[PDB]
Amino acid sequence: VYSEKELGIPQLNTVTPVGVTKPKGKKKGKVFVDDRESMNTILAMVEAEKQGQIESKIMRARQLEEIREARRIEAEKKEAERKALLEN
Template sequence: MAPIKPKTSSSKGGTKSSSKPSGNSALKNKKRTASAVGKAVQKKSAPKSGPPKKKKRIYTEKELGVPTLNMITPSGVQKPKGKKKGKVFVDDQESMMTILAMVNADKEGQIESKMMKARQMEEIREARRKEAEARQYDKRSKLEETKDSLRKRHRRKEDASITEPDADPQPEKPRRPSKKRVSFG
């Protein structure tokens, strides 16, 4: 009785060859060669399956020459190539000083322009005020003039009435009493 060997390999041929005596060695060789060929064929066929993998090469949009869509890419998505990821810190004193100098110059300019504008506005306002004052003065002086002239005329009349009280009664007589008038409309 042949010793029972535990089944180790799953292939049938393997078990057969181990259990049977070496009488049909040619057959076995044939089988082996066939299996070897098969294996070789299988092995060869494996690299043959490579080319379809090659087709999976990913082309960039540039290579394809696809016209680009006119769309907005969010700022978070945009990644400039060749640039370092993350924030760029300003920690050295020189770069901070340059930023500060820029800011200072900017502010100085702003303040200067503000002051200039304020000064110009002030000048315009002053000129306007002066003009208004001059106009007021003119108006007042004209008024005074007319007042004076009226006063003078009044005084002259008074003087005249004082100096010639007796000579006048006659010319007053021809003056008719005012007619009564009626107006329509």
């Protein structure tokens, strides 16, 4: 029993995509979510994990819908910032 991070196990292209992967040991990129909307998205996912099991289908659906709205607002703000950068 040893930590997978220490173990040099390469990522594998399962159903969950690997996407683009950083070269090993050289300058992992930094992405900021300093935006309040991104804060709210990740915080809402954290609170979803905190709540966990719920006995109401309606409550589960509304939780999912709220955090989906979180991603939607984050994506809209990212698109607006991309448009602003293209203008500049």
